């Protein structure tokens, strides 16, 4: 029987991060603790909207904040909350597989979507007014539509199989609306839904789900077989920023969040207990230590980091940016 410590974070630390940040993080985490004796560091993973919700609207306390986009911080914690943010790695969208996975060896990039369409061809996503990865599904099925020439491809897998709605904003933008958590009601025989991305791990393990949208640093976690799609609507590249920037996804509570390259971002909350020590752990992050536990774990760093409202961050930290 799992204890609240085993349930919830499965001096203090106390540190909220995103899903996809679980393996670099455990492997910092045991790096802070070897040159800080008395230091247990306690994690929290979760979406990394719902990992802001819990400061900004629940009134909790974290030392760190760790998102998978690094755009929550300023669009939800700045300025009451948060007075500067840090971009220090990259990601990239994917479609993983196994070799259990129906289709297995005949999915490539391009008839992804087509095999997705299949009815016995079962896929899973996270929540998208939770997750980063969750919306970012959204984002790249929409995006597929214009790049393949198939104005169908996000009606068939994501409008006809949940309660996410569409409409065409006056600027030629696509707006996805997801409706409450309980109301987006999957079609059990095609979508299979978690909180967070990295629940949906064993799933695609087990062969519960046959492709899954998730980061590639993940798949190379785990050792999944993905599909490479491309750099035109993966999130991946700078470059194609204003091609991404075409597709937005409103949360139920009215946030909206816009298809962007994938970055992280990083921040001390304005509130925290730990300042201090939290300022030791983000120098660890941001230093050479953690740009290799990065590479190692097959997430791209951005080296050097680039901070926003530098004249707030700690002395230590702006060494380390730029
Ligand atoms: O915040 Mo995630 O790394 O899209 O579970």
């Given at each position: 029987?799992?204890?609240?410590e085993?349930?919830?974070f499965?001096?203090?630390?106390?540190?909220?991060?995103?899903?996809?940040?679980?393996?670099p993080?455990?492997?910092?985490?045991?790096?802070?603790?070897?040159?800080?004796?008395?230091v247990?560091?306690?994690?929290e993973?979760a979406?990394?909207?719902?990992?802001?919700?819990?400061?900004?609207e629940?009134?909790?306390?974290?030392?760190?904040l760790?998102?998978?986009?690094?755009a929550?911080?300023?669009?939800?914690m700045v300025?009451?909350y948060?007075?500067?943010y840090?971009?220090?790695?990259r990601?990239?969208?994917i479609?993983?597989?196994?070799?259990?996975?129906?289709?297995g060896?005949?999915?490539?990039?391009?008839?992804?979507?087509?095999?997705?369409?299949?009815?016995?061809?079962?896929?899973?996503?996270?929540?998208?007014?939770?997750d980063?990865?969750?919306?970012?599904?959204?984002?790249?099925?929409?995006?597929?539509?214009?790049?393949?020439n198939?104005?169908?491809?996000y009606?068939?897998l994501?409008?006809?199989?949940?309660?996410?709605?569409?409409?065409t904003?006056?600027?030629?933008?696509?707006?996805?609306?997801?409706?409450?958590?309980?109301?987006?009601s999957?079609?059990?025989?095609?979508?299979?839904l978690?909180?967070?991305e990295?629940?949906?791990?064993?799933?695609?393990?087990?062969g519960?789900?046959?492709?899954?949208?998730?980061?590639?640093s993940v798949?190379?976690?785990?050792?999944?077989?993905?599909?490479?799609?491309?750099?035109?609507?993966?999130?991946?590249?700078?470059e194609?920023?204003?091609?991404?920037?075409?597709?937005q996804?409103?949360?139920?509570?009215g946030?909206?969040?816009?298809?962007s390259?994938?970055?992280?971002?990083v921040?001390?909350?304005?509130?925290?207990?730990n300042?201090?020590?939290?300022?030791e752990?983000?120098?660890?992050?941001?230093?050479?230590?953690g740009?290799?536990?990065?590479?190692?774990?097959?997430?791209?760093?951005?080296v050097?980091?680039?901070?926003?409202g530098?004249?707030?961050?700690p002395?230590?930290?702006?060494?380390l940016?730029?």
């Amino acid at each position: 029987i799992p204890t609240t410590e085993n349930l919830y974070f499965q001096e203090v630390l106390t540190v909220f991060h995103a899903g996809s940040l679980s393996v670099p993080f455990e492997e910092l985490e045991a790096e802070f603790e070897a040159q800080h004796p008395g230091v247990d560091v306690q994690r929290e993973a979760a979406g990394s909207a719902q990992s802001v919700r819990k400061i900004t609207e629940l009134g909790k306390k974290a030392d760190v904040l760790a998102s998978a986009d690094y755009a929550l911080i300023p669009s939800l914690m700045v300025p009451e909350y948060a007075d500067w943010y840090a971009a220090f790695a990259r990601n990239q969208m994917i479609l993983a597989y196994t070799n259990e996975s129906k289709y297995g060896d005949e999915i490539n990039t391009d008839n992804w979507y087509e095999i997705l369409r299949r009815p016995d061809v079962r896929y899973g996503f996270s929540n998208p007014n939770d997750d980063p990865a969750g919306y970012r599904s959204q984002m790249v099925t929409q995006l597929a539509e214009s790049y393949y020439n198939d104005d169908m491809i996000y009606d068939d897998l994501m409008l006809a199989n949940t309660g996410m709605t569409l409409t065409t904003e006056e600027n030629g933008t696509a707006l996805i609306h997801v409706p409450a958590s309980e109301e987006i009601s999957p079609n059990t025989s095609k979508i299979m839904l978690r909180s967070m991305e990295v629940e949906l791990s064993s799933a695609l393990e087990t062969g519960e789900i046959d492709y899954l949208y998730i980061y590639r640093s993940v798949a190379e976690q785990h050792g999944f077989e993905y599909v490479a799609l491309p750099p035109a609507i993966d999130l991946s590249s700078l470059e194609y920023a204003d091609n991404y920037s075409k597709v937005q996804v409103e949360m139920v509570n009215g946030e909206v969040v816009t298809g962007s390259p994938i970055v992280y971002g990083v921040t001390i909350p304005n509130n925290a207990e730990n300042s201090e020590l939290a300022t030791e752990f983000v120098a660890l992050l941001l230093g050479e230590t953690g740009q290799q536990i990065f590479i190692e774990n097959g997430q791209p760093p951005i080296v050097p980091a680039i901070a926003e409202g530098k004249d707030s961050m700690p002395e230590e930290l702006q060494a380390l940016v730029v």
